[PDB]
Amino acid sequence: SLPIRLLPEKLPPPKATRGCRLHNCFDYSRCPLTSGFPVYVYDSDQFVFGSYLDPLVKQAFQATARANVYVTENADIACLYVILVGEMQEPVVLRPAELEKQLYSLPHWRTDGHNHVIINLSRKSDTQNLLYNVSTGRAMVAQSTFYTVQYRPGFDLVVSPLVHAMSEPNFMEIPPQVPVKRKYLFTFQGEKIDYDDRIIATLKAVQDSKLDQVLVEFTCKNQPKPSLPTEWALCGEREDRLELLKLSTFALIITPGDPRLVISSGCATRLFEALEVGAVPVVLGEQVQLPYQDMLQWNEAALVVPKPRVTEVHFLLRSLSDSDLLAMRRQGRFLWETYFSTADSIFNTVLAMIRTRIQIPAAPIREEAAAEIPHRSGKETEPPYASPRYLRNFTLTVTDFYRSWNCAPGPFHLFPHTPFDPVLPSEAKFLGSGTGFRPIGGGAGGSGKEFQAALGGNVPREQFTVVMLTYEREEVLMNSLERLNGLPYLNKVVVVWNSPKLPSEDLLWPDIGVPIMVVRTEKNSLNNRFLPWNEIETEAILSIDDDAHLRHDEIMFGFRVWREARDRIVGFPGRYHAWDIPHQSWLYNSNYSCELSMVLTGAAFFHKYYAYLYSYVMPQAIRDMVDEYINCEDIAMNFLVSHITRKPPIKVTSRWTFRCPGCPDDSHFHERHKCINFFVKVYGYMPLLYTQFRVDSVLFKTRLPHDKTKCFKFI
Amino acid sequence: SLPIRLLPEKLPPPKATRGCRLHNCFDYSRCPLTSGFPVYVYDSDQFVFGSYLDPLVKQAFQATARANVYVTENADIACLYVILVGEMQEPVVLRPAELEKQLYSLPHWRTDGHNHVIINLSRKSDTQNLLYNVSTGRAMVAQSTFYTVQYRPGFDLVVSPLVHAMSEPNFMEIPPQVPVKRKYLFTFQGEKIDYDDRIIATLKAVQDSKLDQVLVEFTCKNQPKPSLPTEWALCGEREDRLELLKLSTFALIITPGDPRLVISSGCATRLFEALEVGAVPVVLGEQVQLPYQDMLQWNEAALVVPKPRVTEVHFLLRSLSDSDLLAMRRQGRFLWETYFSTADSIFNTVLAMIRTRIQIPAAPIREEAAAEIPHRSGKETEPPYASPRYLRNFTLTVTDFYRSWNCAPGPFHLFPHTPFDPVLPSEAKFLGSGTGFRPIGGGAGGSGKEFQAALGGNVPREQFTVVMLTYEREEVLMNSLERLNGLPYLNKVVVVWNSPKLPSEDLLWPDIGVPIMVVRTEKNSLNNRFLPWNEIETEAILSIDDDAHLRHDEIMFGFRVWREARDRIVGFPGRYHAWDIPHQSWLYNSNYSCELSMVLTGAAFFHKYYAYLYSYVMPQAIRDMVDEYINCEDIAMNFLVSHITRKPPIKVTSRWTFRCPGCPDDSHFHERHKCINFFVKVYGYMPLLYTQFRVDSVLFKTRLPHDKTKCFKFI
Ligand SMILES: *[C@@H]1O[C@H](CO)[C@@H](O[C@@H]2O[C@H](CO)[C@@H](O[C@@H]3O[C@H](CO[C@H]4O[C@H](CO)[C@@H](O)[C@H](O)[C@@H]4O)[C@@H](O)[C@H](O[C@H]4O[C@H](CO)[C@@H](O)[C@H](O)[C@@H]4O[C@@H]4O[C@H](CO)[C@@H](O)[C@H](O)[C@H]4NC(C)=O)[C@@H]3O)[C@H](O)[C@H]2NC(C)=O)[C@H](O)[C@H]1NC(C)=O
Ligand SMILES: *[C@@H]1O[C@H](CO)[C@@H](O[C@@H]2O[C@H](CO)[C@@H](O[C@@H]3O[C@H](CO[C@H]4O[C@H](CO)[C@@H](O)[C@H](O)[C@@H]4O)[C@@H](O)[C@H](O[C@H]4O[C@H](CO)[C@@H](O)[C@H](O)[C@@H]4O[C@@H]4O[C@H](CO)[C@@H](O)[C@H](O)[C@H]4NC(C)=O)[C@@H]3O)[C@H](O)[C@H]2NC(C)=O)[C@H](O)[C@H]1NC(C)=O
Ligand SMILES: *[C@@H]1O[C@H](CO)[C@@H](O[C@@H]2O[C@H](CO)[C@@H](O[C@@H]3O[C@H](CO)[C@@H](O)[C@H](O)[C@@H]3O)[C@H](O)[C@H]2NC(C)=O)[C@H](O)[C@H]1NC(C)=O
Ligand SMILES: *[C@@H]1O[C@H](CO)[C@@H](O[C@@H]2O[C@H](CO)[C@@H](O[C@@H]3O[C@H](CO)[C@@H](O)[C@H](O)[C@@H]3O)[C@H](O)[C@H]2NC(C)=O)[C@H](O)[C@H]1NC(C)=O
């Protein structure tokens, strides 16, 4: 049944509009929890705002709105209405009471603008406050400048300036995150035309003490940029400021002298620019409302210090450990990239903030609809069962609010399942939550007999899907497929057919007792092994090359380990990244080693979640390099999983190579060094980590009494 | 240097007091970051409030304040001043403008009450609003009732009612957290003397549909408790309400009809009582300010739903998975126990909230100052080095704000170190952050030769401390101590001397090349093995029985695993908890097994952090049972670590028993079943989890070319 309707206005005084919140100004009857989040975007060219808008802001916004999954042309079903009103070209022609009249004239304003968001994106001006004298009815406002009189907390939205309108940021211009300490401990540049005076004297004295390398400037070389009253105006051009910030461990941001100025375009620009190049922001003044602060824990990316504690800032900056400081820089890069960096970022964030505030789940991430190549086949006791999907829509939107917004990958997509589902406590399977659980010995445990009879573990039973990439290797494919006949817990085999030429019509595919789905590929890419094929109906994927020889016992043990390490790559070929001491860079190393940091996906388990991330969220430059060299997709997936988890992979059994006994250049090996170092440039840091152990079954090589059996014969 | 002083008042209008925030009303010059957080508590018996106070509130508050580590009698050094003003006995004799005059008369009010917190704790009344007509100067207010006009967000504090004044809650009366689903999906009891009417009709229709078992009552059997206008008054007595809530999966809380009533004592009592017995709160009305909401992510413990979405509540409650619902119940127990349950909880929370808001670290957790028993001794190349301490004071207070408050153990103590310090990315050790790092092969890696020469890993080098408990076993003690001679990375051996009788004067302790510190125990307890002895100068503890035989290679491998699993018990004797199918309870099981859930601390590594938690934070009832049976401290530590981490332990090597080859009842074994099931009652759930693997060195049992060596000879 529909949510209860908000009673509209039948003109409302300024005190009434300042009291708008979701609980009294939003019409939930337009937004059932299960109806998606349809968004109507007004075309600003049909209204007075269009011709006064900054042209780059308008163009970038229109392009993002056209590409957005939530946007509908059907106003009668929309939950949210979006109007872009600025920023406007300077000098601002349009008068305020006029802006108000055109808002109230919008096609679907109804009496009061309920369920509207007014978006006003900064780019070139730091003095605009377009809506100050404007009654906004029941609409929300999203912009970078607010005085206290106008900001409605939990209702309005503080957003990022739109810097890269109709451009793309170049990540290769971002300084590496390591070394932690840069030339200057901190810097500041500004000019101002209460506590201000002590701040200046304190910071000047830090510089004069020569206890650290700092650069603080309280005038600009040339004329400062125009600003609001009491603001530390920006100096120079963006390119000048960034050159210093790239050399700064920390960037000071001194909030405006007037405490009523909650946030300004100029302040938000200082934040943007510091985060863009890894200078950890140090914000003096707690009265500030940073962009998206209702959703983001800004203390993880920025020091936000009261102005009276300016006398302690030097000590504080010197007291942070390298690992804590690096974590702050890494978090700043995540926040900046995800929520600030592009028009897509900003629009996605506005919509996700409103959607999340009204408890609606994100749109489901897309998948690879596969074209099956039907084929003919040649000549435990239950049939395949799929993993259940979309069981946590509300939990992952609302209950998991902190991680959804403050941990990669962010809040924009709904996945069918993830590796981070909480485990039930171990008594629940016996006391009412036992569906699908298969405890060893019915809960009494046991030795190898009981162990082989039941998956056990801490989660219900499930199956896995083999994904096998093939190209021009038809004979070896049929044979390795035949090796899967009889494999326990196998749901199906997905064969990714990369060759331009289709499978010969006269082909007898082995009957292995589960479906073999051959999927056609629009192009020939190693990246296709990590596409989230529609045909994969499990969470667990066993990724295997068409020439890998794994025994069934090895696969079964790997599966059981993965079921207890669901966020990891769990697999057989362990490798590591080696430091090239003279060249100060990385090398790929596949020697026998006591320490590992990668498990190759030519023989490994991982969660389907990472197929979605690899394919649709991870930077395009990584997939492009994989296709340039036809190499390194295994390295790329290890980078991705270790970035998300901050853990090494898990290596299973004493196996080192995994091809056939009888089965088989240098340039390919050197490409892997180049991949590793390029991926580090894309990420900004090396995410791989080392492990000094492998996993074996509990009773491996253990001498047992006669009434006990090993978990496995050989592993 | 001191923080900048706030300029005082030289009477201030209501608009001014409603604008108080930390940035304009708090004097940071009284609170340097490094001066602790000294708190002065007024004795309310010296002021008019004392004789009007509720006597149980006053008595419980005074007792907590007397026992508090922050409280000082020296007003000239205090950062914060605390005055208890209520709740008052009914009918309220004292008039408002009078309350105001006595506040302004407090000894250290100065002109305006800056740096004061006025505490008004509810217990018996739901109609009091003592400070409504009271000017509070620059003081903060902590209470359970606020209208919008009076609540200053980020400055005032919404707190819990004081239910157990001068009593202790009995955890054995709390229903177990499992089964997830209880008799009633949801319940509500209230009576009210806008959206209200649709809520009633919607919920009545859910009950009438008989699609779930629910019990919703909108009148009380007898006269309802007095309440504020538009509130759903409480029914009956606390004992009546709890009896129904114990049978409720979810508890509805319908917020007051008047949106200006931000929170009330009655609403906060409904929250308290639901959380007390595991009913997951479903709060209808988002305008509410729940207790401690600035610090706590309430969505993790409660569904907070707009009143218009009442028509979707039934669907929502039915859509939550068992594991998500159980996680919400578990989080509610943590929040309730830590911040609501006792006067200590509430006072600790008020002080910690203010302290955290002004960026000051918690007081350091105490330690066991040891009495060394000096002794005489009988007859890699560097000397012992201690682990560094207190490197994250600001980070763990401010940057880690989310986890500090929303994850066990909570925010009240500062530890010297913890197992959750973020790791540096793997290039940082080569590019400026390398102090203490010992990479294998200088970063090039290698095989067993290179591996034995360097700890490697992802953290700098460190040492470990052996902790060995002994009692009446003097001969075997000298011998097992001698087995530690030559052990790499050993900092020292702490011998915990439990026997009432001291060590014979004529005793020659072996010289093993590191200090042997023998510590005297005030009493003979197994719990003493987990005291955070002053003498332990490392993070890593190797806990070993006086009769355990470990080889040096085993210890070294275990240490390397622990260095990469620092939050886990990493050790040798693996055991598990078995379900007793007919009795629906747990058993201790030490058979050979393919699945483990405990590693016994008679031979295991763990972080000193858990010694502090075990000794000083974990429930006393667990330590009491250990002393009653002289048993089960190993089980207790596994419960603790798996509760904190939600992970199983890690078992190292194929060893099952760990006593001497030649070395050695039933009642002791049956005590372990009783311990396991009692500990489950204390926690509310079983925290142990299963693992189906052990760890071995990477090249264990691996065939190698001649130019490569195994990491270890035997493991
Ligand atoms: C098993 O374990 C062993 C031991 O670690 C490991 O051997 C090492 O292998 C690496 C990589 O192949 C070697 O590093 C390279 O050294 C190059 C110079 O090597 C000479 O000198 C050593 C002794 O000093 C001799 O033993 C050796 O035989 C050679 O005569 C050096 O040029 C390489 O640097 C390339 O890559 C880095 C990026 O990290 C880049 O910065 C460099 O510039 C260089 O790239 C080249 O750039 C030029 C232009 O600038 C360009 O023209 C050229 O195309 C680029 N590409 C190359 C390939 O040069 C690198 O440092 C190391 O010496 C070996 N050590 C030993 C003791 O042999 C095995 O590789 C491991 N086996 C497996 C299968 O993993
Ligand atoms: C290695 O692995 C084996 C296989 O799992 C395991 O053997 C099991 O051991 C457990 C525990 O010792 C046994 O469970 C107990 O069974 C009791 C009855 O057992 C009889 O029946 C079986 C066949 O049915 C016979 O084989 C057996 O020899 C006996 O004749 C049962 O009474 C026990 O229950 C106690 O504990 C629960 C708490 O979980 C409690 O609820 C019970 O009430 C009972 O407590 C007793 O209460 C009474 C009053 O109510 C009180 O007077 C008394 O003092 C209390 N204490 C006891 C001890 O009774 C429990 O269910 C199980 O039968 C064994 N299985 C087999 C196949 O033998 C080994 O223990 C493992 N070895 C190691 C070293 O781990
Ligand atoms: C959690 O979110 C997912 C994803 O948004 C929801 O899945 C979607 O559910 C709807 C309704 O069941 C599906 O639409 C329906 O499709 C069927 C065909 O099977 C059609 O007959 C219906 O008339 C309707 O169009 C939709 O396909 C499905 N989306 C996906 C990607 O599976 C799910 O319902 C949500 N669960 C809860 C409990 O809220
Ligand atoms: C992080 O917090 C810890 C714990 O509060 C701080 O440790 C404390 O530091 C003070 C000042 O150094 C110590 O007091 C001093 O003791 C020395 C004796 O060594 C004495 O000569 C001085 O006059 C003064 O009284 C205090 O003992 C110490 N506490 C503990 C438990 O070690 C630490 O300083 C903080 N670190 C940072 C960077 O803020």
Residue numbers in the entry:
A (entry chain A), B (entry chain A): 154 to 163, 168 to 350, 374 to 559, 579 to 863, 869 to 919
Wording from the paper:
The completed linker tetrasaccharide represents the point of bifurcation in GAG biosynthesis: either EXTL3 adds an α-linked GlcNAc and initiates HS polymerisation or one of two closely related CSGALNACTs adds a β-linked GalNAc and initiates CS polymerisation. We show that selection of the GAG chain type occurs at the priming step: CSGALNACTs are capable of initiating CS synthesis on all GAG attachment sites, whereas EXTL3 requires specific features in the core protein to initiate HS synthesis.
The large dimer interface features an intermolecular disulfide bond (Cys793–Cys915) that staples the C-terminal tail of one subunit to the body of the other subunit. All mutants assembled into disulfide-bonded dimers, suggesting that their folding was unaffected. The activity of these EXTL3 mutants was assessed with Tetra-BETA and TetraP-BETA as acceptor substrates. These effects were even more pronounced with Tetra-BETA as substrate, indicating that both the phosphate and the acidic residues in TetraP-BETA contribute to EXTL3 binding. We found that EXTL3 specificity is determined by a basic exosite >20 Å from the GlcNAc transferase site.
